[PDB]
Every structure is written in structure tokens, then in C-alpha cells.
Ligand binder design. Structure first.
Ligand SMILES: C[S@@+](CC[C@H](N)C(=O)[O-])C[C@H]1O[C@@H](n2cnc3c(N)ncnc32)[C@H](O)[C@@H]1O
Length: 224
């Protein structure tokens, strides 16, 4: 795959070189090009440089992470979850699950909130390139959080880095605590669901910044 800003048929110097120089490209070879916004298949026309290609068929850029990415975040005060669902949507979350935690101020979510979150979601995906829209389900209790093939819980009291446990091939389950945070009993209770504690640095982070940090380290970090 090559990088061509705009898919105009003119591969920038760097791209032209590597393909012909290193990869050893010739006239006829069918490769793909993308500019980050769209993509398509091509057929090396002239080696230039710059190498001029022939777009054969417009492709649909891979936008999804690859595995299911569930975000279990505690109900936040105000419209915080609105900023979370947005960033999370553009970060790869394929499903967002609000959680009712001991210290989570709000204990429930009205159809109005669940409405705006879904609105924000279906918009964030649209504005991120994603065609898939993350599912924003009605809140539930921690106890409901099922067993997970893989789970990471942003825990201030942890020593494990995400890049030391993250298994790219297996689905992903994330968990962030409310403004107050997860209760010592809640945390371990999640670990009993398959959630491995993870640190997001040596500074206190808002539930929103925490969900973003965690998410970014499991997708944007791995370049997926
Ligand atoms: C802002 S914290 C609540 C206050 C925090 N327990 C404290 O006393 O420092 C809410 C959530 O943000 C996430 N978080 C914030 N800072 C974190 C950190 N340094 N490491 C891991 N998670 C963190 C966790 O999900 C935490 O439950």
C-alpha cells in the first residue's frame, strides 16, 4: 500500500522511490494507494519519477480496529459521557457500556441521554471515517460486566503497562471508574471477570481523559 494525498495519480517523491527503489516496482504492477480519507486499487503506469499509477477500483479503507472493542465506563456527571462516546467512537470502540458503580453519582440514564449519546456516536463515526456505529447501550451494574477474553481496567493503583498485556488478536474490554472511581471491591470484582489492572501514568486523570488514554493505547497506539 502506498501513500498518495488525494489519490490524484501522482505518488509523492518518497512513495515513488520506496516502491520502485526498494520494493522494485515495474509497469503493470497492481498496488493500492490512500491519502487517509479514501482509497483505491491501482496499476503502476510510468515509473517517473514520480511514479504515475492507474486507479483501477475505489476501495473502502479499513477503519475498524479488527476485534470487538467494548468500553465499560461508569456513569459520569453532566454530559461527560458525551465527550467520551465521541472520542471513543473515533478511537475504535465498537460498543460502549455505561456502568452504575458505587461512587458513580448518577445511578441511571434517561432515554434522553441515551438518545444524545447515540446521536454523538453515529456522528463521531461519520466524522472519523467509520461506517460502523458504536452501540451505546442503557446503563447496567458492574456485576453485569461478563467474562472477557481480554479486559483492561484503568486503575490508578496498578503497575502494569498496557503495551505489556495488550493482545491485539483477541477482543478488547476496557473499564474506567467514575469521578470518584472504582471501589477496592469493585476493581478486584472486575479482575474476576478477566480485567487486568493497567496504569495510565503517575497523575490523576479525569474519567474522560482516562477512557481516551486507555482507548488510544489499544488502537491509535497500535496504528489500527
Ligand atoms: C479520576 S479517577 C477518581 C480519583 C482517583 N481514584 C484518585 O483518587 O486519584 C476516575 C477514573 O479515571 C481513571 N484513572 C485516572 N487516573 C488514572 C491513572 N493514573 N491510572 C489508571 N487509571 C486512571 C480510572 O478509571 C479511575 O477510576
Amino acid at each position: 500500500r502506498a501513500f498518495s494525498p488525494g489519490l490524484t495519480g501522482v505518488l509523492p517523491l518518497r512513495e515513488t522511490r520506496h516502491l520502485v527503489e526498494v520494493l522494485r516496482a515495474r509497469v503493470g504492477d497492481r498496488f493500492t494507494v490512500f491519502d487517509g480519507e479514501r482509497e483505491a486499487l491501482a496499476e503502476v503506469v510510468d515509473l517517473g519519477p514520480p511514479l504515475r499509477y492507474r486507479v483501477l477500483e475505489e476501495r473502502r479503507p479499513e477503519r475498524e480496529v479488527g476485534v470487538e472493542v467494548v468500553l465499560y465506563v461508569a456513569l459520569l456527571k453532566g454530559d461527560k459521557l458525551a465527550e467520551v462516546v465521541r472520542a471513543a467512537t473515533e478511537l475504535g470502540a465498537t460498543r460502549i457500556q455505561p456502568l452504575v458503580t458505587r461512587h458513580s453519582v448518577p445511578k441511571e440514564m434517561g432515554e434522553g441521554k441515551l438518545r444524545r449519546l447515540r446521536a454523538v456516536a453515529l456522528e463521531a463515526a461519520k466524522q472519523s471515517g467509520r461506517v460502523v456505529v458504536p452501540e451505546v447501550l442503557p446503563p447496567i451494574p458492574l456485576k453485569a460486566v461478563p467474562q472477557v477474553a481480554q479486559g483492561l481496567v484503568a486503575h490508578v493503583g496498578a503497575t502494569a503497562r498496557v503495551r505489556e498485556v495488550l493482545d491485539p488478536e483477541k477482543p478488547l474490554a476496557l473499564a474506567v471508574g467514575p469521578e470518584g472511581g472504582f471501589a477496592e471491591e469493585e476493581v478486584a470484582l472486575l479482575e474476576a471477570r478477566g480485567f487486568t489492572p493497567v496504569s495510565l501514568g503517575r497523575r490523576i486523570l479525569r474519567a474522560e481523559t482516562a477512557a481516551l488514554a486507555l482507548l488510544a493505547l489499544c488502537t491509535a497506539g497500535e496504528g489500527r
